[PDB]
């Protein structure tokens, strides 16, 4: 197989340092000090201006065979777990089609644009022992999700690069809903806590209490956050978890905010989503026992583009839970417009 060549790997005899820890120097801006050593270094990659990591199959040829096998067994298509996976399919389809074509296989890979959240599917690709394979796109009768594969691939090893690293995907030996743990980084230091990977950045901090402070989701996925990489996962009420478990929300008490419950009806279908606790520009939020109950997350702008100024909440805490998306700024479920006149507002239709 000529699409892959390795370099140095882990098992190489390193006399200088621990090969499976991160080794370097960093400035601790709190204490204002420079420290070198070995350990675990967690970086923010969700908010990077370009992609450091890129998926590629370990063997394109092998992957083409996995697909034609799946095609024979009734698997009409596939749904990606993440934007990065989607970009791999988008980037490798012409290569796959060539493999299939030159081997006289009546099958072509079709990958459609994915705008919303990356949803789950029941089927799985497996290793070896209509004439199209559709990746993502809208939900159709021609290729329903229930016949599509999802979360069938995981990272085997990484590829060196100068301004970007390759991640090579292999076929999973098992069936899980769990996110690939190889790309997960979780850490807590100086009472600041991070649950992260290549698309989620979830930050909780101890102010007067431990609570969620900020979250950035480059996409909204449907895999499961592993317990191995989860902080504070004892005595959990899934109702209190701000980011829903079914949306790769960490089953962690860090994933909470007093006054708030599970945002099952947040704007998850908006693409990139950023959660934090501040006021939407030009709006206000006041406590009122005479306020509406939890409902779909509402955007602070109308379909026309008019601004809803006055907002209320029954029993939440301030500052309000705020979403920021491409289409504007939204408020958490427990926060409702104060005026009952619906001006044809924009609300989430997700319910997850």
Ligand X SMILES: *[C@@H]1O[C@H](CO)[C@@H](O[C@@H]2O[C@H](CO)[C@@H](O[C@@H]3O[C@H](CO[C@H]4O[C@H](CO)[C@@H](O)[C@H](O)[C@@H]4O)[C@@H](O)[C@H](O[C@H]4O[C@H](CO)[C@@H](O)[C@H](O)[C@@H]4O)[C@@H]3O)[C@H](O)[C@H]2NC(C)=O)[C@H](O)[C@H]1NC(C)=O
Ligand Y SMILES: *[C@@H]1O[C@H](CO)[C@@H](O)[C@H](O)[C@H]1NC(C)=O
Ligand Z SMILES: *[C@@H]1O[C@H](CO)[C@@H](O[C@@H]2O[C@H](CO)[C@@H](O)[C@H](O)[C@H]2NC(C)=O)[C@H](O)[C@H]1NC(C)=O
Ligand U SMILES: CC(C)(C)CC(C)(C)c1ccc(OCCOCCOCCOCCOCCOCCOCCOCCOCCOCCO)cc1
- Residues contributing to the site for ligand Y (CB under 6 A): 123-124, 175
| Closest chain position to ligand Y (CB) | 175
**144 vs 319, beta carbon nearer a copy of itself:** 319
Binding letters toward ligand U, positions 136-165, x by CB under 6 A: --------------------------x---
Q: In the bound complex, what is the minimum distance in angstroms from residue 161's beta carbon to a copy of itself?
A: 5
Q: How far apart are CA 108 and CA 98, in angstroms?
A: 9
| Closest chain position to ligand X (CB) | 208
Q: How far apart are CA 63 and CA 170, in angstroms?
A: 8
Binding letters toward ligand X, positions 310-339, x by CB under 6 A: --------x---------------------
Q: In the bound complex, what is the minimum distance in angstroms from residue 126's beta carbon to ligand X?
A: 21
Neighbour tally for 349: CB within 10 Å: 11
Q: Is 207 in the site for ligand X (CB under 6 A)?
A: yes
Q: Which tokens in the block code for residue 338?
A: 């104060």
Binding letters toward ligand U, positions 293-332, x by CB under 6 A: ----------------------------------------
Q: In the bound complex, what is the minimum distance in angstroms from residue 85's beta carbon to ligand X?
A: 28
**34 vs 344, beta carbon nearer a copy of itself:** 34
Q: Is 44 in the site for ligand Z (CB under 6 A)?
A: no
Site of tokens 């990489």: 229
Q: Is 161 in the site for a copy of itself (CB under 8 A)?
A: yes
Nearest to 243 by CA among 142, 108, 337, 117: 117
Angle among Cα 179, 274, 28 to the nearest 5 degrees reads 80
Structural contact between residues 251 and 227, judged by C-beta atoms closer than 8 angstroms: yes
Residue 231 Cα distances to 46, 96, 236, 352, angstroms: 20, 40, 12, 23
Query: Which of 23, 38, 132, 302 contacts ligand Z by CB under 6 A?
Result: 132
Nearest to 131 by CA among 166, 104, 151: 104
Angle among Cα 261, 265, 268 to the nearest 5 degrees reads 115
Query: Which of 42, 105, 110, 188 contacts ligand Z by CB under 6 A?
Result: 110
Q: Which tokens in the block code for residue 272?
A: 């990139």
Question: What's the per-residue H, E or C state across 314-344?
Answer: CCCCCCCEEEEECCEEEECCCEEECCCCCCC
Q: In the bound complex, what is the minimum distance in angstroms from residue 209's beta carbon to ligand Y?
A: 19
Query: Which of 181, 246, 288, 302 contacts a copy of itself by CB under 8 A?
Result: 181
> What is the binding site for ligand X (CB under 6 A)?
12, 207-208, 286, 318
């Amino acid at each position: 197989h000529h699409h892959h060549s390795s370099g140095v790997d882990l098992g190489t005899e390193n006399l200088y340092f621990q090969s499976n820890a991160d080794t370097g120097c960093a400035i601790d801006i709190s204490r204002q000090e420079l420290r070198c050593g070995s350990g675990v270094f967690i970086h923010n990659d969700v908010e990077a201006w370009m992609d450091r990591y890129k998926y590629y199959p370990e063997t394109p040829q092998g992957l083409a065979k996995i697909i034609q096998k799946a095609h024979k067994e009734g698997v009409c298509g596939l749904r990606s777990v993440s934007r990065l996976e989607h970009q791999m399919w988008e980037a490798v389809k012409d290569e796959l089609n060539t493999l299939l074509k030159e081997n006289g296989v009546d099958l072509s890979v079709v990958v459609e644009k994915q705008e919303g959240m990356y949803k789950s599917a029941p089927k799985r690709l497996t290793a070896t022992t209509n004439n199209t394979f559709v990746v993502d796109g809208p939900e159709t009768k021609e290729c329903p999700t229930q016949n599509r594969a999802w979360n069938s691939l995981e990272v085997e090893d990484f590829g060196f690069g100068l301004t970007s690293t390759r991640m090579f995907l292999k076929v999973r030996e098992s069936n899980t809903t769990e996110c690939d743990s190889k790309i997960i980084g979780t850490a807590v230091k100086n009472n600041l806590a991070i649950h992260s990977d290549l698309s989620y950045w979830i930050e909780s901090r101890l102010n007067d209490t431990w609570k969620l402070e900020r979250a950035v989701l480059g996409e909204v996925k449907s895999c499961t956050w592993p317990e191995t990489h989860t902080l504070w996962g004892d005595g959990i009420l899934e109702s209190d978890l701000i980011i829903p478990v079914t949306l790769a929300g960490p089953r962690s008490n860090h994933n909470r905010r007093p006054g708030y419950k599970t945002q099952n009806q947040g704007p998850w279908d908006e693409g990139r989503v950023e959660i934090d606790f501040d006021y939407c520009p030009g709006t206000t939020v006041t406590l009122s026992e005479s306020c509406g109950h939890r409902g779909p997350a509402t955007r602070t702008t109308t379909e026309s583009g008019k601004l809803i100024t006055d907002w209320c909440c029954r029993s939440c805490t301030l500052p309000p839970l705020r979403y920021q998306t491409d289409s504007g700024c939204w408020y958490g479920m427990e926060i409702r417009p104060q005026r009952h006149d619906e001006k044809t507002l924009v609300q989430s239709q997700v319910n997850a």
